[PDB]
Design a protein around this nucleic acid. Structure first.
Lengths: 143, 67, 64, 140, 143, 68, 63, 140
DNA sequence: CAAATGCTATCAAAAAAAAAAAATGATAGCAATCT
DNA sequence: AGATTGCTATCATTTTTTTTATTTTGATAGCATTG
């Protein structure tokens, strides 16, 4: 399954969405894509911090009445078990120089437990987490 | 992508060759199609385009970093 | 028999992969089933003759 | 919506199978013909009750690999709802002078739950349970 | 879990119901007791066959409004799988001596699938089916 | 009916030994009771007595056999 | 670590056997778990001290 | 109920643990004290970042057999519902001049979810998030 | 007392690990067809 | 005449299936000690 990080699902909503990315999102089976409660927290906070006006309001509705509901049942929580993975994903990174930040750890950790792939623009961190990543911004080649 | 279907009964196989021929195409073209239609049927929603619309609706937004 | 499907749309592939797993099957088995069902449809079985054959083959029987 | 009764499905398997019944079975759309678990159980038992030899073994082979797979998905189960029907059908006939063998009642109640047409050689029992019937030993 | 055969579920409903049997039914936890669709049929028909009067109307109600509901979800259908088992349980017993009546084969076969214990007064048949049996009419010794 | 329980936390044992002494029972008796108590809790309904009532309400029935 | 329960009401035994299987564990694990829960409810842990000691037990740590 | 912020639940372990905090934790009814998976994550990471050795090995042992098992069943997950709360809590405070660390936000939100009184030495944040607070460094 | 307890035992079945065998998923390589 | 197609093959995994140990239950049997 695929776990979408904040920056990937944010792209389409931008002024000039990245063509390649959108296309990628378009080649997926919704029921296969998930979201970490963390990422949902962020998306909602990102919305809440806007200036009051039409844009914010519309976007809010779209968020609660359109986007998120598509992910019902697939928004992953950061529960006690995930916490174990977390502690190990970060520790293992520190003892290899490459540091991983809490937020990224939460997301990574989540992904790892359910053995998923993180789709992010910043694969930079996640590789050190020993978890599969995919940059929708880049291309795909041979194996 | 590519995929190899091993252990395909000659019966089914011949059935598919027949289908393709009858339909005026190659077997690999027939399977590609058969699968495509199925895939088209599962594709309930298109996440990208779906989100894109919203963007286009509010004229795009740049959401604060935060992390 | 073996069959290779190349240049398969990425999405179409994601979708099939989905069906397979969501049903606890390997993608390969999934496609194999699909093609199997199609053959199944395309075919019009002759129930009467089918059995009477199997019966003439085993010297006939009587299952009460 | 056709439901084969034991004696029908097993007719072609016999030594001097009735060609009229074979012809009829050959005129059906397999995706429209059902079987009762009770009936499949009777067939499976018929096979299992055979003296060991090549015969019993090839028959079993077919029975499981060729015959039965054709009805996969359409072998109706005898459950609670159907058990209520059974009671009605049988209690009714019995209290009006017509006897209905449990064996038959099972098929009958099943057919009756999906408004199916029972195909059988002994139509009496089913006409009695108020179930569409068809005797393939005839024409039309 | 245990599978009640017709004759046990009937015992209490009778005139001078064997006490030992009623005692054993009470030492049971409902959620553990199951009925075969075949058995429900038998019960349902046994009622239907009574002469029309008050007794039959009440029994029919209690039967469908009290008894049976108590086994909701624990009423076992005679499905295709069970049939295969039935086929062996009977052919076996025969080529071994004690032959089994179809009805009893349905029940046995059903029980066996889920490796349940059949509670019946007529155990003399089931044991020949390689299914565990228990006679509540009898005393418990167990080693 | 008897049953053994090996590898029982030594702390748990004392806790139970304590509870038993607190009440006027033996440890075995206390186990029997803490057990019997939850069992009676699982007892949502008593099938036997239940069917019996139905029997007594109608003066008892005698269903036909019906079974080859 | 060992206890024998005899003269146990064959029925109470049933009830337990039941709760046991329903949770996928042996009847024994069940008793063991039941008794274990009793002990826990009879106990009042003093969270502060209990940690304060594990702390001094290892030379102190910070998270 | 009571949710222990990370700093409180870890004080007793510090070298020269503050006695006022230890004594208060001792007056609590364990069955009413909770932890957030977030807090549990940092606790565990805290143990992981120690040089493999007796210290780390024992701390770990104790952390998994003696400490956390005490909160078994009361370790609150950060889920969708909470995520929404977290978003309101941080947006409000922030668009009002009081920065709320995302760290603290996850707790305040967890607490605000089930109506709990958070225990922490950083009272300031939580007051701003509209959540009952208690500083175990003081008395009462 | 004899019945009840508290412990250790037996002892034959059920209920992690090590090895062996399939498939699966990704291409890779050609000769024979179609465009 | 370069792309497509039909068939095989390589190969590093996954996933199963089968063997081979180890643990655990069940169930109840000794034995010296209180209602």
């Amino acid at each position: 399954m695929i776990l979408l990080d904040t920056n990937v699902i944010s792209e389409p909503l931008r002024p000039q969405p990245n063509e390649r990315v959108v296309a990628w999102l378009d080649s997926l089976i919704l029921e296969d894509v998930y979201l970490s409660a963390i990422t949902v927290a962020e998306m909602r906070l990102g919305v809440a911090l806007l200036l009051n006006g039409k844009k914010k309001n519309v976007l809010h509705e779209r968020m609660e009445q359109s986007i998120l509901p598509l992910f019902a049942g697939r928004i992953l929580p950061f529960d006690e078990p995930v916490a174990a993975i977390y502690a190990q994903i970060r520790s293992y990174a520190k003892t290899h120089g490459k540091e991983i930040a809490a937020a990224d750890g939460y997301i990574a950790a989540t992904a790892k437990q359910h053995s998923m792939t993180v789709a992010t623009r910043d694969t930079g961190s996640f590789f050190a987490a020993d978890v599969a990543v995919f940059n929708p911004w880049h291309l795909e080649h041979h194996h | 992508a590519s995929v190899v279907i091993r252990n395909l009964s000659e019966a089914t196989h011949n059935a598919i060759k027949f289908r393709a021929r009858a339909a005026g195409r190659s077997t690999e073209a027939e399977i590609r199609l058969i699968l495509d239609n199925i895939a088209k049927a599962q594709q309930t929603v298109r996440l990208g385009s779906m989100l894109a619309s919203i963007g286009q609706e509010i004229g795009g937004v740049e959401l604060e970093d935060v992390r």
